[PDB]
């Protein structure tokens, strides 16, 4: 039912080698979600690494901008649930077999035969990105995804091969922390990790820190851009720009709006292509 020429293949599954050899089939395995006969391709990424043939088909990868074999996004290198939780639009897809699954899957394959270049619904909302998901976007990822799965007979001590067993050895797995939408167990801990980062400890008073020491101005930040980026938060009382240290001083009437600026600018407010420097003001008349 499905033929292909080349799969999606994000970089963490290609391997460390730009020179890999790959064999192909015409009708290979079924997808583990919808059982569609795609074309499984097989290659060797590394010398200590398993083959990682193919998990899903091309069509289900073209719905949500997903790679081919490890089920992560191509645009970041993240799972699907983090992506549509950060963008707050799920682009729903059924769960059963013959109820509504293959119906809308065949129709979305039928309407996407022209382009084959972009996903069906994420083309308009993958543009307003790089704000909340750029904070965890791992460059040069760990190659432990590519290492082979654990073998038996070393857990029981029966392995006659010894060192020439190609899979792994001396790796005790843990039965406490290991599909398409939900639910994923370590991903909940990853959302707890991004919800429990390392900010500055909030001093115990009643919102008196309305000043803020922001610097790194140079020639990109100007006064009108900064006061219009503060104007969407609210109104000023006394603002200034100092150029001997390349810094700006802003305050607010009732602190809370600038408080989310404190949520916005903990090495996080990225305007004009620069990681700005932010530390605390005095708020003490010192």
């Amino acid at each position: 039912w499905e033929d292909a020429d080349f799969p999606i293949l994000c970089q963490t599954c290609l391997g460390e080698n730009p020179y890999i050899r790959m064999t192909k089939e015409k009708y290979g395995k079924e997808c583990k979600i919808c059982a569609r006969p795609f074309t499984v391709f097989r290659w060797c990424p590394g010398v200590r690494m398993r083959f990682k043939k193919t998990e899903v088909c091309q069509t289900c990868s073209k719905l949500k901008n997903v790679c081919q074999t490890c089920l992560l996004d191509l645009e970041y290198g993240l799972p699907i649930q983090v992506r549509d939780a950060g963008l707050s639009f799920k682009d729903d897809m059924p769960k059963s077999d013959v109820n509504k699954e293959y119906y809308t899957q065949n129709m979305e394959r039928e309407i996407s035969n022209s382009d084959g270049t972009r996903p069906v619904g994420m083309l308009g909302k993958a543009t307003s990105t790089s704000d909340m998901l750029l904070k965890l976007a791992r460059t040069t990822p760990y190659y432990k995804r590519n290492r082979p799965h654990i073998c038996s007979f070393w857990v029981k001590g029966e392995c006659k091969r010894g060192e020439e067993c190609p899979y792994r050895h001396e790796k005790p797995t843990d039965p406490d922390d290991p599909r398409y939408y939900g639910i994923n167990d370590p991903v909940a801990d990853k959302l707890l990790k991004r919800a429990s980062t390392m900010p500055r400890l909030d001093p115990p008073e009643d919102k008196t820190i309305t000043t803020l020491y922001v610097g790194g101005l140079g020639d990109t930040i100007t006064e009108t851009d900064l006061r219009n980026h503060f104007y969407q938060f609210g109104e000023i009382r006394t603002i200034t720009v100092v150029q001997r240290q390349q810094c700006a001083f802003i305050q607010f009437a009732t602190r809370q709006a600038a408080e989310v600026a404190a949520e916005k600018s903990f090495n996080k407010l990225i305007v004009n292509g620069r990681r700005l420097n932010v530390k605390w003001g005095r708020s003490q008349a010192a």
């Binding site: 039912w1 499905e2 033929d3 009708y27 394959r109 035969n113």
Partner: protein, 41 residues
């Protein structure tokens, strides 16, 4: 790209569907061939 059951999705090598009469007899010049049709009254 996903045709019907006749194309690839079946090994039903069915009866009555065989390469029988795999050559077409053409109407030659002694019959009412279209070359003699294009000029007769």
């Amino acid at each position: 790209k996903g045709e019907g059951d006749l194309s690839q999705l079946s090994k039903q090598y069915s009866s009555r569907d065989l390469p029988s009469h795999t050559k077409i007899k053409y109407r030659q010049t002694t019959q009412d061939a279209p070359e003699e049709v294009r000029n007769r009254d």
